[PDB]
Design a protein around this ligand. Sequence first.
Ligand SMILES: Cc1ccc([C@@H](CC(=O)N(C)O)CP(=O)(O)O)cc1
Ligand SMILES: Cc1ccc([C@@H](CC(=O)N(C)O)CP(=O)(O)O)cc1
Ligand SMILES: [Mn+2]
Ligand SMILES: [Mn+2]
Lengths: 410, 410
Amino acid sequence: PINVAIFGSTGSIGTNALNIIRECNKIENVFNVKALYVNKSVNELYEQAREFLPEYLCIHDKSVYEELKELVKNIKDYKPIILCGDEGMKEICSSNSIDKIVIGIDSFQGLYSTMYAIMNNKIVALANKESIVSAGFFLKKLLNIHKNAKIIPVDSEHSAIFQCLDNNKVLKTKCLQDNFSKINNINKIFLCSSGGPFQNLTMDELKNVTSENALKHPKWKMGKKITIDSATMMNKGLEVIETHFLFDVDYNDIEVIVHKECIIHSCVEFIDKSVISQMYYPDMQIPILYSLTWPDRIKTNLKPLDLAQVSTLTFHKPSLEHFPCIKLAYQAGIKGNFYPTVLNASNEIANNLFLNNKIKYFDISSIISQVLESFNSQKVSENSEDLMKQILQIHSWAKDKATDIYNKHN
Amino acid sequence: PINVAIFGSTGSIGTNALNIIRECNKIENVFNVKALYVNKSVNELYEQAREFLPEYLCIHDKSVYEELKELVKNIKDYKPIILCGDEGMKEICSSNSIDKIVIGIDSFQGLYSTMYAIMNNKIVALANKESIVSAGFFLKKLLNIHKNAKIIPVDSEHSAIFQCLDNNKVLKTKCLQDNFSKINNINKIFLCSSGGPFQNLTMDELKNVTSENALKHPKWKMGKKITIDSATMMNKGLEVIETHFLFDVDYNDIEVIVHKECIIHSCVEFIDKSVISQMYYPDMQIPILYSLTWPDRIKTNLKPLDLAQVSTLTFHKPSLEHFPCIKLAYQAGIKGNFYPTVLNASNEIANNLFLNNKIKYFDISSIISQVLESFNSQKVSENSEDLMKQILQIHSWAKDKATDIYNKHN
Ligand SMILES: Cc1ccc([C@@H](CC(=O)N(C)O)CP(=O)(O)O)cc1
Ligand SMILES: Cc1ccc([C@@H](CC(=O)N(C)O)CP(=O)(O)O)cc1
Ligand SMILES: [Mn+2]
Ligand SMILES: [Mn+2]
C-alpha cells in the first residue's frame, strides 16, 4: 500500500493524479491518499477531502484557513489535521506515514515543497520543471546530501525518457545525479513536442498571433501558463534544460523534434544507436502513475493505444527563426551559471504579458533575450542556504528587469 | 570481456555478427571470439580465423578437416584447438571459456546445436525462429532443466520487444518460461511487419503473383525463403507463435501491425497501458549485437537514426482475406499441441514450391490449411527425448503430406 501526498491537488496534475489513483484503487486497493495541499482553492479542496478523506489538509494562504475548517466540519466521522503555509507543508513532508509526494505546484513557488520533500528523503514525483530549470544545481547538491530522496519525473517527455530506461541501470544511480547518462548508456535524447498551434504559420502570420489564438484547440488539457509556453516553444526550451539536469545529458545531445500527433512522448538513443521510445495517447495519467509505482507498473483500465487507428506519426525539426525561445533556452543552458534562472524568471514575466495581451509574440523572445544579455555570471555560493538566496535574488532581479524592459518600451 | 562462439559463422547472421563485433572492437576491445564453426567453407573459415583468432575452430564436413589444418598453419602465433563434426560442436559448447553462442544454423542441425548450448547452461543468441515455432515445447522443457541456460532473441521484432523490457524484471525470469509475461507486466504486443510487397494488391491480383514479384522491393537484405514468407506474411505468422513462446503472451494479445517504413520494430504494451517501442533503421546488426551485450549496451559507429529525415511512420492492420497465412498461424498456434510444427513444416514445402513457380499464392495457404486439417492431435511426450522424436516425426509427416497434396493436385 503506497502512501501519497499531493501538492497542488486541485491543479491540472493534482486532479489527474487523484483520478488515476481513484481508478487504480477500484481495481485493487494500492494507494492511500494521506495529504492534500492547495494554494487557495478551498471549495475544491473540501470536495476532494470529502471523497479522499486524507489525514492532512493544507491550505497555503492563511486567510482562508479558518474557512477550510468551516467546510470540513460538515464531513461526519472524519477529522483530519488541518495546517497552513510552509509550516503545514513541512509537517506533511516529515510525516513518516508518507512515502511519495506529487509536486503539482508549478512555478518557482514549488521549489520550497520540493526542497522539503527531498530533505525528508521522500520519493518526489515532480511536475514543476521551473524548479529544475531555476534551481537545478541546488537540487543536485541537496540530493547529494539526502541520499535516499529520489526525483521521479512527471513532466510527460521526461517520464517518457525515464520509462525508456532499464531500471537495472537506473537503480545504480538517480535523477539529477552526475553520471546518470553514462550509467544508463544514453547517447542522445529525442525531446518530442506537440509544436503548439503556430507550427505552420509563416513569419508574417506569426508576428500577429494573440493569446486567444494560442489557447484555441488545446492538444493537451492544461493551464494557461504552459499553454503559452507551448505556443512559443519556451515550454520545450525549459524542458531541454530540465532534461540536462534530470539525466545529465549534454546540450549537444538533446534534439527537439516536433511530433504533432502527441503519441510518442520522447525517445532515448543509447550508445549502440538503438532507440527506445514511449507512446500513448496524450494523457497525463500515465506519467503521474508511473512516478507513483516506479520501479513497478500496475494495471489500469485506460483506453488501449490503437496504432492502426492513429495510423500516422510525423517528425520535423522546429525552425529556430519562428521559435527563438528554443534557441534562447539552449544558450542560457549552455552558458550555465544562473543563466537558466534568468531565462525562467524573465519568461514568467514575458509569458504573462503576452497572455494578457500586453506584448507581441516576438516581444516575448526579445524581452527574455535582453534580460539574459544584461546578466553577468556570479560566483556560485558554496553554502547551500547562500545558494538559495542567490537563486531568489537573481530570480527576483530577472523578473524586475523584464518588467522594466517592458515598461520602458513603447 | 564477452566470450562468444559463432555457429554457422560464414552464414548470414554469422557474418553479420562478426561485422558488428569487428566494428565494436575497433572502438574498444570488448568481444573475445572464442570459437567459429562452419559446415564446409574451408577458405572463409580460414580467413575469419586469421582475423578473430579464436581458441576453437570447428568444421562439420570431416572431408576438409585436414585441409583446414594446413591452412591455419600459415596464421602466425596461432595454435587453436581444431575439431570437426558434432563432436567439435559439443566440445565447444562444453568450454567454460565460452559464455554466449550465436546460433547461425538452420534445420535440425541448428536445433541440435541449441540443445547442446542449453545443456551447457550458456546464453544462446538464437536467430532461427523455426526451431522455436516447431520445437517450442522441447526448448521450454529443456530450459526448465538447465536453469542457468538462457535464450536471447535475435529475430529483430523479438529483439525489439526484449529491448523494451525492464531488465530489473527480465533478470528475475527468462525467455521461453512460464510467467515471463506476469513478471514483466506485459499486457499486449504490437508485432510490426514490413507488410511485404503485396499490401495494396486486390484479391484478383494476388491470385496471379509470382516469386519474381515477391523478390522485389527488398526492404531488408534477406534470403529467398524468408522473403517469400514476408510476401505471404507467413513470416509474421510464425513470429506470432515465436512471440507466444518467448514471452508467454496469449495469442489474443499479439497484434500484427503493418509498418512499411520499418523503423519501429515492435512495441510492448504494459499493464498500465503505457507502450514502449524500439526504433532504428532496418538493420540486423543491433539485434545480434544486443543479444551479445544484454543486459548491457556498448558503443557503435552505426549511423544515428535521423527521425526528422525519416519524417513519417505509418500503421495499419493487415487484411486476413489477403494474407490468410496469418490466420492459419493464429489457428495452429491457438490449437497448440503439435499444430505449429505442422504449420511450419507444411509452409517449408509450400513456400519452396511457390518460390519455384510450382503453385500460386493462395495455394500456399490452401496446402497448409489442408495439412493442418488432416493432422490429429497426439498426446505430448513427458519425456524430453520422446518429445524431440515426436517433433521430428510430425515435421517429416507434414512435409510429406504437403508434398502429397501438391502431387495429387491436377
Ligand atoms: C495546450 C498545450 C499543449 C501542449 C503542452 C505541452 C504539455 C506538456 O508539457 N506535457 C504534456 O508534458 C506539450 P508541448 O510543449 O510539446 O506543446 C501544453 C499545453
Ligand atoms: C524482403 C524481406 C523483408 C522483410 C522481411 C522480414 C524480416 C524479418 O523478419 N526481420 C528483419 O526480423 C520482415 P517482415 O516479415 O515484417 O516483412 C523478410 C524479407
Ligand atoms: Mn512536458
Ligand atoms: Mn523478424
